[PDB]
Ligand binder design. Sequence first.
Ligand code: FAD
Ligand SMILES: *[C@@H]1O[C@H](CO)[C@@H](O[C@@H]2O[C@H](CO)[C@@H](O[C@H]3O[C@H](CO[C@H]4O[C@H](CO)[C@@H](O)[C@H](O)[C@@H]4O)[C@@H](O)[C@H](O)[C@@H]3O)[C@H](O)[C@H]2NC(C)=O)[C@H](O)[C@H]1NC(C)=O
Ligand SMILES: *[C@@H]1O[C@H](CO)[C@@H](O[C@@H]2O[C@H](CO)[C@@H](O)[C@H](O)[C@H]2NC(C)=O)[C@H](O)[C@H]1NC(C)=O
Ligand SMILES: *[C@@H]1O[C@H](CO)[C@@H](O[C@@H]2O[C@H](CO)[C@@H](O)[C@H](O)[C@H]2NC(C)=O)[C@H](O)[C@H]1NC(C)=O
Ligand code: NAG
Ligand code: NAG
Length: 466
Amino acid sequence: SAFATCLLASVGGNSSAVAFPNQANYSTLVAPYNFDLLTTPSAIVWPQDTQQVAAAVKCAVDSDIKVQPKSGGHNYGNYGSTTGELSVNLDNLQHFSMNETSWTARLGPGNRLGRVTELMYNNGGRHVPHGTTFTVGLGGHATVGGAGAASRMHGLLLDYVEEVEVVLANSSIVRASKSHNEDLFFAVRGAASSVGIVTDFSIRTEPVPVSSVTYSYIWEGTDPAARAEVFLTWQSLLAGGSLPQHMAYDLVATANSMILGGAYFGSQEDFEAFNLSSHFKVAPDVTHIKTYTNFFDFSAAASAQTKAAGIASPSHFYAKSLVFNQQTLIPDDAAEEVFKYLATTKNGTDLYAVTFAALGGAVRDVSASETAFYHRDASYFMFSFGRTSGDLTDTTVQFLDGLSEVLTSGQPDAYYGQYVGNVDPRQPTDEALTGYYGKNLHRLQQIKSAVDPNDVFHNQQSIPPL
Ligand SMILES: *Cc1cc2c(cc1C)nc1c(=O)[nH]c(=O)nc-1n2C[C@H](O)[C@H](O)[C@H](O)COP(=O)(O)OP(=O)(O)OC[C@H]1O[C@@H](n2cnc3c(N)ncnc32)[C@H](O)[C@@H]1O
Ligand SMILES: *[C@@H]1O[C@H](CO)[C@@H](O[C@@H]2O[C@H](CO)[C@@H](O[C@H]3O[C@H](CO[C@H]4O[C@H](CO)[C@@H](O)[C@H](O)[C@@H]4O)[C@@H](O)[C@H](O)[C@@H]3O)[C@H](O)[C@H]2NC(C)=O)[C@H](O)[C@H]1NC(C)=O
Ligand SMILES: *[C@@H]1O[C@H](CO)[C@@H](O[C@@H]2O[C@H](CO)[C@@H](O)[C@H](O)[C@H]2NC(C)=O)[C@H](O)[C@H]1NC(C)=O
Ligand SMILES: *[C@@H]1O[C@H](CO)[C@@H](O[C@@H]2O[C@H](CO)[C@@H](O)[C@H](O)[C@H]2NC(C)=O)[C@H](O)[C@H]1NC(C)=O
Ligand SMILES: *[C@@H]1O[C@H](CO)[C@@H](O)[C@H](O)[C@H]1NC(C)=O
Ligand SMILES: *[C@@H]1O[C@H](CO)[C@@H](O)[C@H](O)[C@H]1NC(C)=O
């Protein structure tokens, strides 16, 4: 086809840097993360640099094909491999350099977070707040938000993004920053996937913490009332404002445990002195506290823990998200109903996790309207994850759907955000857009119309032009 010819030329005739349906191994090359929502892109291309990205986009445009990039491939709907669209695989764009005058790093989108973490540490003992899973790609992560262990302390990853290079739908290459193409910069910091392909990032850094203390307190058992009590305490201690601003603080419910976990940036002695578990009516069954003098080790261990938990690998699953704030905190009775629901509902899973992850702190230092990330006044995220041994069934979809309903049952008609970093393809696109972007939606549609009127950069739940 013209498309195939064009697209081979976009990578300089390197036939290893393009793949088409009907090539051997195509479904493996697509590399699904979610194993249920398998896709067949019209082609996959592996550009070497920005120019080849721009060339490949043009090939799609010339053949009336739409485009998504793929960096780490962690999208929960495999949207970076959308069916019938060009998948621009950015695995080759993994450059890294450190400006030691400012400790600002310049990095390609194909860097996965484990490499980002290693290279920032090695280049002068630096880091930036980001997520905990090492296989997440920077390209899709810095462009949605990027919340992790250091976020209460320092904010989102995208709060450290100072400049980007972006390939636009017409194959123009631009830069964006707070001082230049400010509108594009707004959209890239939380909604890049709808407006262009980020081919380079300049990211400010912080010195690593001197001391990083991981904690984990576990309550074992299946009693819904006991579990609700742990949740309610967890929620009220967060809402009360007594927690140290810098400390990561999360609660994970599984079928047989509640795990209060996080990170404290200070001495183990000072952490232990704070006596976090004393606020709970029932003492945890297990406490694990570990100090890391090396921040790379801390980060590697955090990544290894989520992988070991079974919730961080390509798999069959469904997953949903919600944002809660001081105005939508879950009432006592609804929390009781949440844990009753988890206790008795037929779930179809081989594993589930319901994660409550505190935000606040430095995340709130930036206003909702300053970047495309809307949820700045959030108290916490709720992420639900239901893994299955074989193909997903409606049992598990209904399970998570009904869970979101009971979680919001204290105030069913209030606004609830969703994190666009954890896409939920099994809902109306209208509800998704409203959840993902909130009142930033209108401005994003304006920018979409400005930079991509023909909707080249499209997925199931992308921002539509006006
Ligand atoms: C899989 C996963 C995700 C995850 C997580 C744990 C796991 C196991 N833990 C997270 C956490 O602790 N904190 C957080 O903030 N997010 C966490 N996530 C979610 C992760 O941030 C998102 O899934 C993120 O978007 C993944 O990025 P990645 O780069 O790996 O994924 P992708 O499928 O290739 O892309 C996602 C979407 O963004 C678009 N994209 C990709 N690259 C670009 C560039 N360069 N420019 C513009 N858009 C880009 C894709 O097209 C897709 O729509
Ligand atoms: C609500 O969700 C619960 C959580 O998923 C459901 O329980 C789960 O039920 C499945 C199916 O019965 C069960 O499957 C696994 O059980 C064996 C033991 O677990 C192994 O898991 C690790 C890997 O994760 C494995 O490497 C270890 O050897 C470990 O022993 C497995 O051998 C088997 O192949 C299968 O994977 C889950 O264990 C079970 N989870 C728990 C912790 O209970 C529950 O059924 C559901 N309830 C309702 C009402 O629907
Ligand atoms: C031809 O294209 C392929 C794909 O881009 C290139 O192979 C990759 O090379 C990198 C090293 O630069 C390896 O780490 C990857 O595993 C390869 N990616 C694949 C196979 O998808 C190859 O270098 C290119 N040849 C050139 C540029 O002459
Ligand atoms: C390709 O599209 C971009 C984005 O619409 C165009 O850039 C804009 O051009 C208008 C009018 O000149 C400016 O007001 C905007 O500030 C530009 N936006 C950017 C750069 O983000 C660009 O001109 C188009 N290129 C071609 C050759 O048509
Ligand atoms: C496809 O993958 C298999 C297994 O990984 C490999 O042995 C084979 O050489 C691949 N085929 C092609 C045409 O690359
Ligand atoms: C923490 O609080 C509990 C009471 O809930 C108390 O028994 C324990 O001694 C305290 N631990 C400290 C401060 O080391």
